[PDB]
């Protein structure tokens with residue numbers, strides 16, 4: 001459940017965009033604050049919001065994880081990433097979750113939609129979901 005105070009685009013940036021992320025255990029705290037249980041896995045794309053918006057404006061394709069949607073877009077280049085892996089599953093409380101940091105590099109596929117009235121008018125079309133990385 002995305003917290004109502006944030007638009008889909010804002011929650012996407014909070015969960016998946018970070019050029020220079022801190023350790024996973026630290027970065028994930030803000031995200032787990034709004035959940036019932038700690039997130040098992042989360043990926044941060046080391047790029048800028050502006051760059052993802054550009055990927056939105058390219059060739060459209062069916063979303064791999066949900067082919068009924070023809071609103072996905074694949075990046076042209078592989079981008080560095082930071083995978084955050086949960087260490088204590090079901091174990092420790094949602095207050096003391098620790099993560100392992102794991103670097104990676106690949107293409108990403110995002111679903112994009114029309115901006116929310118609360119979003120910046122500068123970007124008519126914005127990224128709202130990370131479908132997968134290849």
Ligand SMILES: Nc1ncnc2c1ncn2[C@@H]1O[C@H](COP(=O)(O)O)[C@@H](O)[C@H]1OP(=O)(O)O
Nearest residue numbers: 001002011012015016039041042043128129130
């Ligand atoms: N509207 C949506 N469309 C597609 N995937 C979604 C949507 N809402 C949540 N998800 C994805 O479902 C999974 C489980 O959601 P949750 O843990 O909140 O229940 C996550 O990978 C999440 O993506 P995301 O990682 O961006 O949150």
